[PDB]
């Protein structure tokens, strides 16, 4: 090892005496050991792109070869940690140096080698067992929520020569040692994986289970699945935090991985303040979400090669926790700020531009990234199954979905929750547009619904029809004068507003509307569409009978039924049980049926 510096011109260092140095390997330049990466070889010389500031590097300085590309450390110490695109432990730099800056050429391990971890081996394993790549051979009790499963790296195999008893070990002790063909491998609690390589699985399964968020919209009208791909608009004043807060607090996920890819300086200071404050309830107790969450945090002035490799660090962490058997949901905030760092890294290398200056390989990257999500059957013996759900965020200039990044990401992803600012200014929350949003996972969730909530899909189609009809009846009510209104259309324009105001609108600052279970959702939609059906038939039967019914009689014969409909969304799911709310909704149904028979 130990080449030397031959020339420096900007961020580009040239190193001599680097004979056996691989491409895209990482190196440390100078006496402060700045981190850089090899981008070209020529004879005995290597061309290095340095990530930090090269100001002060002289000729003859050392160059240390690391031997591996950009990789991540995977072991106990990830939950509640705060990293960046290079996986530097920000909250440990902050406390070991006692300065408010990130030092230049700082070399600290991502997982601390001081904590003693509680490790218990697999009770069936003994000297002579046949263990392959992926097998869980121990468990570290990370915290009260997450059990950390110790797995063999995906490429090893052999017979157990030694396995450690239960006890306390740090992430440097040899906990396993196996043998193959006369060669020994020692393995500790931490394994290293390159971030640009997909982790192996046994098979990629189709996604057929819902991702419960807790909002009535996004769970009825635009469903996502466990293993899916979503995209939202990341803009100012659109009410965007509902998505990440719902995912973190009330969701069926086990592990959460949040990624900022070059956010503003004060926008990161808000996430790093809010996220350690959210809480969940588990087994009756209240715990912090940072017991099952990891954050990757970059700002606009951090190295451009960390604002680009952030997405890969995040997806590798989530693929590491998917291989244990968990269901992970990753969230990448402002994927556009990643695409811009991509374009800038290209520009530095003097590469031919493509449409709008972005590199040639933009759609290839954006597609091979989202192809890393999904449900899988995990490699290894104890027969588990995991999942990774990716939620990206795009920032189109002025709400224009023609930028190359927005066009590509809308071509790829299957769901699209369209947050709107217009609805936010009207105090309509969650401000989802319901007219430009979509979801193409609705045919995969068909055995699930038909097995668990049989009478739901018809209600979904009916509600979508009603909400579309109230909208394409707009010029009819403006260019004409609200009077030439067939009674079917009066019934629509009233019940659709009932839906818009008492189903699609939810308020998190309450004790009853933070979380809406799905039985409550299907009940609240069934009562509304059943009303609609009965009130529509009552009118269109007595069409020519000299007893013309109009909405004016329907709104006077049932003046409390309508209130109780508009009051369905106050039934607490905790202070009232599930059978109680079911019986209340059934009573309201029978009262509706009565008060509709006592009208004919």
């Amino acid at each position: 090892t130990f080449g030397y510096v031959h020339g420096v011109s900007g961020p580009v260092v040239t190193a001599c005496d680097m004979a056996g140095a691989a491409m895209y390997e990482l190196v440390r330049v100078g006496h402060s050991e700045l981190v850089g990466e090899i981008i070209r070889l020529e004879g005995d010389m290597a061309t290095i792109q340095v990530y930090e500031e090269t100001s002060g590097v002289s000729v003859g300085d050392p160059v240390l070869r690391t031997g591996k590309p950009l990789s991540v450390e995977l072991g106990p110490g990830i939950m509640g940690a705060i990293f960046d695109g290079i996986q530097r432990p920000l909250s440990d730099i902050s406390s070991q140096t006692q300065s408010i800056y990130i030092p230049r050429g700082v070399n600290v391990s991502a997982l601390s080698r001081d904590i003693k971890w509680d490790f218990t081996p697999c009770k069936n394993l003994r000297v002579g067992s046949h263990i392959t790549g992926g097998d869980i051979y121990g468990i570290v009790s990370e915290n009260s929520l997450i059990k950390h499963k110790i797995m063999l790296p995906p490429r090893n195999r052999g017979t157990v020569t030694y396995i450690a008893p239960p006890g306390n070990y740090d992430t440097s002790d040899v906990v396993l040692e196996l043998e193959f063909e006369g060669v020994k491998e020692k393995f500790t609690m931490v394994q290293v994986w390159p971030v640009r390589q997909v982790r192996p699985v046994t098979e990629k399964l189709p996604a057929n289970h819902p991702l419960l968020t807790g909002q009535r919209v996004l769970d009825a009208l635009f469903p996502c699945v466990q293993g899916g791909t979503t995209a939202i608009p990341g803009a100012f004043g659109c009410g965007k935090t509902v998505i990440s807060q719902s995912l973190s607090k009330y969701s069926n996920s086990d592990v959460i991985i949040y990624v900022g890819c070059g956010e503003r300086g004060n926008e990161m200071s808000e996430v790093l303040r809010d996220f350690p404050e959210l809480t969940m309830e588990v087994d009756g107790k209240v715990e912090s979400i940072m017991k099952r969450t990891a954050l990757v945090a970059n700002t606009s002035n951090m190295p451009v090669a960390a604002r680009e490799a952030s997405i890969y660090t995040g997806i590798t962490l989530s693929e590491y926790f998917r291989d244990m058997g968990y269901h992970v949901s990753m969230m990448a905030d402002s994927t556009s700020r990643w695409a811009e760092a991509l374009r800038e890294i290209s520009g530095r290398l003097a590469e031919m531009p493509a449409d709008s200056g972005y590199p040639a390989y933009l759609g290839a990257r954006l597609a091979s990234f989202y192809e890393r999500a999904g449900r899988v059957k995990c490699l290894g013996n104890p027969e588990r199954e995991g999942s990774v759900s990716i939620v990206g965020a795009v920032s189109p200039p002025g709400g224009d979905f023609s930028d190359p990044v927005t066009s590509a990401t809308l071509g790829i992803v299957q769901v699209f929750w369209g947050l709107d600012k217009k609805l936010a200014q009207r105090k309509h929350f969650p401000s989802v547009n319901w007219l430009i949003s979509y979801s193409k996972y609705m045919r995969a969730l068909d055995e699930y619904y038909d097995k668990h909530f049989t009478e739901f899909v018809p209600l979904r189609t009916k509600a979508k029809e009603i909400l579309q009809e109230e909208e394409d009846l707009a010029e009819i009510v403006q260019l004409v004068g609200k009077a030439s209104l067939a009674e079917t259309d009066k019934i629509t324009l009233e019940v659709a507003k009932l839906i818009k105001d008492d189903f699609l609108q939810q308020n998190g600052y309450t004790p009853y509307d933070r979380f809406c279970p799905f039985y409550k959702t299907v009940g609240m939609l069934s009562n509304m569409i059943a009303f609609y059906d009965m009130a529509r038939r009552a009118v269109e039967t007595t069409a020519q009978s000299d007893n013309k019914i109009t909405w004016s009689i329907i709104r006077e014969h049932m003046g409390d039924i309508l209130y109780k409909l508009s009051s369905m969304k106050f039934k607490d799911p905790l202070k009232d049980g599930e059978a109680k709310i079911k019986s209340d909704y059934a009573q309201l149904l029978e009262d509706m049926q009565n008060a509709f028979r006592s009208l004919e």
Binding site: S58, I100, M268, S300
Partner: protein, 460 residues
């Protein structure tokens, strides 16, 4: 320290453009500082730009005129650009390279700081809370600025953004609830009339003791324009995070900085980027705009106010477009309001402050701030629409409630926006003017003010 003697080289091997290529340099160090002595005796200064083996490429600040390859000497300093910094720099005028141009001595140093600086740890920065009071009601009252924000001013050529910058500089301070404050001013690429105006206006309005002025002129070396904002921000960081003051940093015409960046890029033989400017201009602007904010454990802040001129009045030119991706909000200096003889010509409809919600409220300015601002914005937009309809419908066929939205317009532009270049209005005077304007409409038309506040502040 550095106790080894320095080396002088008489081995110039090439001269072209602003670059001198020297050979037989012992261990050339990148970005080093060099002192050249010309054949007759004049002394110039330079910086190492490229290094290769035993060969250095020095960029000379004052040009390469009269330099030959047989009698010019180059003495190598041994280190990089470190500037001296102390608290006595408040009340002084330096040029772009940091030497005194106000008939005073050199800075006696409290420390020597590297002007490139290190990035702030994203985990130590905290959220901006209180208010920075500029004394201009168009900004204070409706586009409030928080302690730690970064909010630019967008203007064009001929518009009066330098006088707005000067008024902000000589009025800004902290809100007087019921003062550790300093200003660092960086003027880049200004002509001589602008520089004269700044210098004299600051030093004769009795305020040049909480100001540090860095003046860079259009005929100065174009490398000094690259290091001017980094000296300004190094001084600001010293003041705010070691002496615990509240610093406001004003940087005038970042477009000239971008032009100097383009020049020193093309000197490296780099192929141009989109529309002229280098491909790495985002990172270079971000290493400037992100040297700001509040931090944990210190009682000081840094607030930044970049000022730009939009070429061709375009909002999608690379410089405004990239400054929008790093900063939080914008102020707009308008040309229709300038031609109508309104000062300051600030258009409040396109302007925005992304962190106003944090700067205003109870205990910071007053409990009625947000509602007064919302109602003034609403009434102004409605009055503009009414003045549009008046031109086709006729002024004799307007309602009585549309005749109120047309008196509010005149009174708002002539009494609230239009201020006066030497008139200092505290936040409370601004809000009282807002209420004097809102009392044109009956209490029942002010829809955006909650009734619990229309009871305390309307009847006066």
């Amino acid at each position: 320290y550095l106790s080894q003697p320095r080396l002088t080289y008489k081995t110039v091997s090439g001269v072209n453009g602003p670059l001198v290529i020297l050979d037989h340099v012992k261990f050339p160090r990148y970005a080093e500082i060099v002192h050249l002595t010309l054949p007759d005796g004049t002394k110039r200064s330079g910086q190492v730009l490229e290094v290769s083996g035993s060969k250095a490429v020095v960029q000379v600040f004052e040009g390469t005129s009269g330099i030959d390859a047989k009698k010019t000497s180059c003495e190598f300093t041994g280190d990089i650009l470190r500037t001296p910094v102390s608290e006595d720099m408040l009340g002084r005028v330096f040029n772009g390279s940091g030497k005194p141009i106000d008939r005073g001595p050199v800075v006696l140093a409290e420390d020597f700081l590297d002007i490139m600086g290190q990035p702030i740890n994203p985990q130590c920065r905290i959220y901006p809370e209180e208010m920075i009071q500029t004394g201009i009601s168009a900004i204070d009252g409706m586009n409030s600025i928080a302690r730690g924000q970064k909010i630019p001013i967008f203007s064009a050529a001929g518009l009066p953004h330098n006088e707005i910058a000067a008024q902000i500089c000589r009025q800004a301070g902290l809100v007087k609830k019921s003062e550790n404050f300093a200003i660092v001013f960086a003027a880049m690429g200004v002509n001589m009339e602008t520089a004269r105006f700044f210098k004299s206006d600051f030093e004769e309005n009795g305020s040049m003791d909480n100001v540090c002025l860095f003046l860079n002129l259009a005929n100065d070396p174009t490398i000094e324009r690259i290091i001017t904002p980094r000296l300004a921000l190094t001084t600001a960081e010293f003041l705010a995070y070691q002496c615990e003051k509240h610093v406001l940093v004003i940087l005038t015409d970042m477009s000239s900085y971008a032009e100097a960046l383009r020049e020193v890029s093309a000197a490296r033989e780099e192929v141009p980027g989109r529309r002229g400017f280098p491909g790495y201009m985002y990172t270079d602007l971000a290493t400037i705009y992100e040297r700001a904010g509040r931090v944990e454990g210190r009682n000081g802040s840094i607030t930044q106010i970049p000022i730009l001129t939009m070429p061709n009045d375009d909002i999608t030119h690379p410089i405004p477009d990239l400054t929008g991706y790093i900063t939080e909000g914008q102020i707009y200096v308008d040309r229709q309001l300038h031609n109508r003889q309104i000062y300051p010509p600030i258009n409040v409809l396109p302007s925005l402050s992304r962190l106003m919600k944090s700067a205003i409220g109870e205990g910071m300015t007053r409990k009625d701030h947000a509602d007064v601002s919302n109602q003034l914005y609403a009434c102004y937009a409605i009055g503009k629409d009414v003045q549009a309809m008046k031109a086709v419908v006729g002024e004799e066929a307007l309602t009585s409630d549309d005749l109120l939205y047309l008196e509010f317009l005149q009174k708002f532009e002539r009494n609230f926006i239009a201020q006066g270049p030497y008139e200092n209005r505290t936040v409370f005077e601004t809000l009282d003017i807002g209420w004097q304007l809102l009392r044109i409409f009956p209490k029942e038309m002010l829809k955006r003010i909650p009734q619990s506040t229309l009871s305390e502040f309307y009847p006066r």
